[PDB]
């Protein structure tokens, strides 16, 4: 006897296509960094 | 910012003196939300320094539409203008008596609300001397 349960936020990933956006840290530059979203001072970094 | 000034002036009483202050590559500002160059809201102030005395404020010009304002004491004989194409500022002081001899400074002001009447950069100073 067994039953099935659904789990939300399960650590599963699959390689996939995805659009990415620029983000810099704050003059007109040929790379439009003034339109980049400002980045956090301390980027999160998690070991696996 | 860079601030080039004119040369020494040796004038005579009752004449007129024109002092040039150049601010290379400083007038225009860039608007990111518009992706274009506009005339900045900067202000150019004009100060004077008699030998040994304290600083004196003449007047300031807002370069956007050239809106000027002079002090009450010198009102009526001093005109401040600017040329945005050559990107410089002109002081025209007329009917100088023997008391107007001094050194005249042009000063830059970012005209940001949180910093009232802040003077960022200054010129070399022009020695205007009147005598007979």
Decide if B30 touches A, using CB distance below 8 A.
yes
Cβ-defined contact of B30 to A27 (cutoff 8 Å)? yes
Please give the Cα distance from A48 to A43 (Å, whole number).
Answer: 16
Query: What distance, in Å, lies between the first and last C-alpha atoms of chain B?
Result: 37
Phi/psi at B102 (nearest 5 deg)? -170, -170
Query: In this structure, are residues B20 and B88 in contact, taking their beta carbons and an 8 Å threshold?
Result: yes
Number of Cβ atoms within 10 Å of the Cβ of B20: 17
Residue showing tokens 């699959």 = A14
In this structure, is the dihedral angle defined by the CA atoms of residues B10, B108, B115 and B111, taken in order, positive or negative? positive
Query: In this structure, are residues B14 and A12 in contact, taking their beta carbons and an 8 Å threshold?
Result: no
Experimental method: cryo-EM
Give the gap in angstroms from C-alpha B100 to the nearest C-alpha of chain A.
41
Q: Which residue, among A27, A30, A34, would best test binding to B if mutated, counting the most B CBs under 10 Å from its CB?
A: A34
Phi/psi at B100 (nearest 5 deg)? -90, 0
Residues of chain A found within 8 Å of residue B30, distances taken between Cβ atoms: 27-28
Residue showing tokens 């010129």 = B123
Tokens of B125: 């100073």
Query: What distance, in Å, lies between the first and last C-alpha atoms of chain A?
Result: 35
- What contacts 24+ positions apart, CB below 8 Å, involve B33-40? B39/B63, B39/B64, B39/B84, B40/B64
User: How distant is the alpha carbon of residue B44 from its chain centre?
Assistant: 5
Q: CA nearest B29 in A: which residue?
A: A27
Question: CA–CA distance from B39 to each of A4, A30, B20, B43, B124 (Å)?
Answer: 68, 22, 19, 11, 25
CB proximity list for B4: less than 8 A, separation 6 or greater: B21, B22, B23, B24, B123, B124
In this structure, is the dihedral angle defined by the CA atoms of residues B50, B6, B57 and B76, taken in order, positive or negative? positive
Number of Cβ atoms within 10 Å of the Cβ of B101: 19
Please give the Cα distance from B128 to B8 (Å, whole number).
Answer: 6
B93 membership: H or E segment, kind and range: strand B88-94
């Amino acid at each position: 006897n067994l039953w099935v349960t659904v789990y939300y936020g399960v650590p599963v990933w699959k390689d996939a296509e995805t659009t990415l956006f620029c983000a810099s840290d704050a003059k007109h530059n040929v790379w439009a960094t003034h339109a980049c979203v400002p980045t956090d001072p301390n980027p999160q970094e998690i070991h696996l | 910012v860079r601030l080039d000034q004119s040369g020494t002036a040796v004038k005579k009483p009752g004449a007129s003196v024109r002092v040039s202050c150049r601010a290379p590559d400083s007038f225009t500002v860039y608007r990111p939300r518009l992706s274009a160059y506009f005339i900045g809201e900067f202000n150019i102030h004009w100060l004077r320094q008699a030998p040994g005395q304290g600083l004196e404020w003449l007047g300031f010009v807002n370069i956007f539409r050239g809106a000027v304002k002079y002090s009450s004491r010198f009102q009526g004989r001093i005109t401040i203008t600017r040329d945005t194409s050559s990107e410089t500022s002109y002081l025209d002081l007329g009917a100088l008596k023997a008391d107007d001899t001094a050194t005249y400074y042009c000063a830059w002001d970012k005209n940001v609300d949180d910093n009232p009447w802040r003077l960022d950069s200054w010129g070399q100073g022009t020695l205007v001397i009147v005598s007979s």
